[PDB]
Amino acid sequence: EVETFAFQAEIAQLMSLIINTFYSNKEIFLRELISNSSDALDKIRYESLTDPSKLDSGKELHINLIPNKQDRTLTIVDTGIGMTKADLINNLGTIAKSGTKAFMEALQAGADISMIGQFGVGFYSAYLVAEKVTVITKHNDDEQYAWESSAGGSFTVRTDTGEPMGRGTKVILHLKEDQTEYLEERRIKEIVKKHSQFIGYPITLFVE
Amino acid sequence: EVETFAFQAEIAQLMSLIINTFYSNKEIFLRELISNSSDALDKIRYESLTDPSKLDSGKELHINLIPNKQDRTLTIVDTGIGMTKADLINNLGTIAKSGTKAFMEALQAGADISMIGQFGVGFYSAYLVAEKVTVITKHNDDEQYAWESSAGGSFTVRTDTGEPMGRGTKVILHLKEDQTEYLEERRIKEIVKKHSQFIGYPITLFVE
Ligand SMILES: CCCCN(C)C(=O)c1cc(-c2n[nH]c(=O)n2-c2ccccc2F)c(O)cc1O
Ligand SMILES: CCCCN(C)C(=O)c1cc(-c2n[nH]c(=O)n2-c2ccccc2F)c(O)cc1O
């Protein structure tokens, strides 16, 4: 029931660079994921002006940060517009082809990994801290899907039979052994305050 | 043939603040407009993956900067997705209600006008340099419209009978008398290099 796909060549190369480069300031992953959540929330909010029934699958527009020391996971949940199967498999890979090329050029021109979000590919900064990422997503117009990748040049997509979520996206970061700092309450608080303080949606940091 | 509308109260108040505050670093207007053009170009590019006929109204995705010393205008043109009448009159005012409130709060909390784009209302930084703004826009699904405002709490919209443009948005900044520096080639070049160097579309600075 599980489809396996190869990444575009440029994305696979971006992911290797992110995993292999020595770069200490890994905490920027969180801002990039919160930023993408915010954009997804903007999208469903705007669509709902012209069609209030888009919020039948959920009225609240918000972001939850959920650390889990047992599973060694950090989960970022939003109730944004979600993603279709086509988004996961094809559409986002395609726009990320040019953004990756632009980004990798700038890095040669001296730029630093922290500028990744200006090229549209800030999601892949998750692999600074995660050995595996799972994405569960639900768009009004499609079914619930699980996307997963451990960054070896391939990703999987399946229909998700797990617990339904209504509308939005959940990003489950399976953290590397030496990156458990991002499960601690004061570390996450520090990072959100420093990088994400002007997001226009509630950000709730769950306690354990 | 011309409809006159009142701005939302919060936007009218944002515009007065932008016009009345002493703030020397006015050049940030250009980055905000180029940023919105880029977002509009992203939108039509993405829509065209799932429906290549959206580019029948124009294949090229680009940004032109056109100074005109005679008319004292600076025009920013893009071939992005364009805006519907509903966008101009109602939809963008509504999302800009919360962004304005958020922004004006931050300014009390010390923030500075240069952060306006983080709240979604960066367009209104045009009134740092313009006494009047005209917006001509064409969306695939609607007709060509002219929006105009001289920031006295009202704006006008009409159907544009002028020369058709295909798809996109043109922003015509009627500059204040003491802001002609933004018509000079070396000044515009300087600003684009400093603030807009990583935009993923061609930016062409027309000569006079
Ligand atoms: C193929 C792998 C994808 C990686 N992921 C999960 C993301 O980028 C990502 C995407 C969304 C998302 N839902 N709906 C939507 O439009 N977006 C979206 C937002 C911003 C840029 C692009 C987007 F598609 C989100 O809410 C959270 C995310 O972390
Ligand atoms: C009511 C007054 C509006 C002010 N203007 C002209 C802008 O903000 C503005 C808007 C667009 C635009 N075309 N299509 C589209 O989606 N956008 C858009 C882009 C970014 C945020 C919001 C948007 F609607 C542009 O290409 C250039 C602009 O300067």
UniProtKB/Swiss-Prot annotation, chains A, B:
Superkingdom of source: Eukaryota
UniProt modification remark: ISGylated. S-nitrosylated; negatively regulates the ATPase activity and the activation of eNOS by HSP90AA1.
Region: Interaction with NR3C1, residue numbers: 1-208
Effect of residue 32 to A: Strong ATP-binding. Strong interaction with HSF1, HIF1A, ERBB2, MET, KEAP1 and RHOBTB2. No effect on interaction with TSC1
Subcellular locations according to the entry: Nucleus; Cytoplasm; Melanosome; Cell membrane
Record's function text: Molecular chaperone that promotes the maturation, structural maintenance and proper regulation of specific target proteins involved for instance in cell cycle control and signal transduction. Undergoes a functional cycle that is linked to its ATPase activity which is essential for its chaperone activity. This cycle probably induces conformational changes in the client proteins, thereby causing their activation. Interacts dynamically with various co-chaperones that modulate its substrate recognition, ATPase cycle and chaperone function.
Domain description: The TPR repeat-binding motif mediates interaction with TPR repeat-containing proteins like the co-chaperone STUB1.
Family, as annotated: Belongs to the heat shock protein 90 family.
Name of the protein: Heat shock protein HSP 90-alpha
Species per Swiss-Prot/TrEMBL record: Homo sapiens (Human)
Gene label: HSP90AA1
